[PDB]
Ligand binder design. Structure first.
Ligand SMILES: Nc1ncnc2c1ncn2[C@@H]1O[C@H](COP(=O)(O)O)[C@@H](O)[C@H]1O
Ligand SMILES: Nc1ncnc2c1ncn2[C@@H]1O[C@H](COP(=O)(O)O)[C@@H](O)[C@H]1O
Lengths: 232, 232
């Protein structure tokens, strides 16, 4: 089967891949500062709906440790005290960008924890990395099957990856992802893609349009059906 | 490499496996009841340190939905109201035990949610199942490497699986896991195992002692080094 093949291959990546291949870049990092009121911290956590957040020093200097949202539950009882960024400040692990993904997985599983901090040679933070970013390597081409079709063109699938119906219009796609794609020649996403290709692709084929990775998720002998796109 | 081989094989399972192979049985299920004070619910959640919990009807009858611990964060602000088992009661998905693991993974990933409810033919709950129970199939033989050795004999690795040093004594092992294993002939865990075998096993070999699954995680040409055990 294909979806097996995908995973199988995804396994082979883990060797070849380094940590600098899966990290959330520092820009994209949703974090906190040791000097933030308990009240406001919850907003960040809620809008983002994560589980672990890096804590910036105070002057964007260093970054102290990591806060797990679940630790905030103690502070919620009756005979419960006031929160303070101290009991729940787990210090945090740092790793080179050069670190091998396989190795990361081992340590992840063995020390039992989910997020680390990636740094460059020069001691700057490049970003962060997590266990799920690893499993996505194997499990990321994996999704359900759709027949008639669903009003939902676009679906988030992993961090940077959406599974979009090919029949979705360039109009509707551009709105959603805020993209600047063009029609006239073609009106739907599958036509855009098929045009970039210049032939009718088969599943797995990939093509770069304007820094966006498009991969033929699903296609027959007449037409592209589903395509995954990776936001840059 | 071996740890690749493991994963690769773990992928092959996903086809052959059904949902009734990975579920947490109803006994082992950490849950809640719609009629539990906000205060006490936190205790359950904290001791267990989970993320999603099934809510029992009120008379152990049906089970209503699932509560995600993160939803409890809204109720923690200043201008925040009183919690009520209603806004945070997501209804919950149910599946046959017969369900194919691959299929489950697809739906898991596509609808984006992590836990489901397994039922038998007759409409009884058999247990629950989650996305991580799936990824463990591929990623569960995966751990770090140890040289000298660490005072830590035993380590949790996944739900039912500990990675124990072979040099660990039957004495110390029995205490920990509450087991009734015997010495005289042999004093360490690797000897117990090697004795059950009757030869020096190679990595991957498995042997059932008293309902406990032992698998040679790590062994050379002289001795068993690490072994994983699956609590029944
Ligand atoms: N504090 C954070 N900052 C940036 N990205 C995050 C953060 N926490 C989680 N993520 C990302 O969101 C994914 C799911 O984690 P979570 O949302 O915490 O369940 C991870 O694989 C990361 O890619
Ligand atoms: N409410 C629950 N009852 C029983 N087992 C659970 C529950 N929540 C999570 N688990 C188990 O714990 C693992 C990790 O989930 P969590 O502890 O929620 O991060 C899952 O793979 C399940 O096997």
């Amino acid at each position: 089967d294909e979806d097996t093949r995908d995973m199988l291959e995804g396994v082979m990546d883990i060797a070849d891949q380094r940590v600098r291949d899966i990290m959330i870049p520092r820009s994209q990092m949703i974090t906190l500062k040791r000097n933030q009121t308990l009240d406001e911290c919850l907003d960040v956590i809620i809008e983002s709906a994560h589980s672990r957040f890096p804590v910036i020093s105070e002057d964007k200097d260093h970054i102290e440790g990591i806060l797990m949202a679940k630790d905030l539950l103690p502070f919620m009882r009756s005979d419960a005290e006031a929160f303070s960024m101290d009991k729940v400040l787990r210090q945090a692990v740092v790793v080179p960008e050069s670190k091998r993904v396989d190795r990361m997985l081992k340590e992840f599983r063995s020390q039992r924890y989910h997020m680390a901090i990636v740094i460059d040679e020069f001691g700057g933070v490049s970003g962060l990395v997590t266990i799920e970013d690893i499993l996505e390597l194997i499990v990321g081409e994996i999704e359900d099957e759709y027949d008639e079709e669903d009003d939902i063109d676009f679906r988030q699938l992993s961090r940077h990856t959406w599974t979009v119906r090919a029949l979705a219009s360039i109009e509707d796609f551009n709105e959603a992802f805020g993209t600047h794609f063009s029609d006239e020649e073609v009106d739907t996403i599958g036509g855009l893609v098929m045009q970039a290709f210049g032939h009718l692709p088969a599943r797995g084929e990939t093509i770069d349009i304007d820094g966006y990775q498009f991969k033929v998720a699903m296609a027959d002998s007449r037409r592209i059906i589903q395509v995954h796109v990776k936001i840059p």
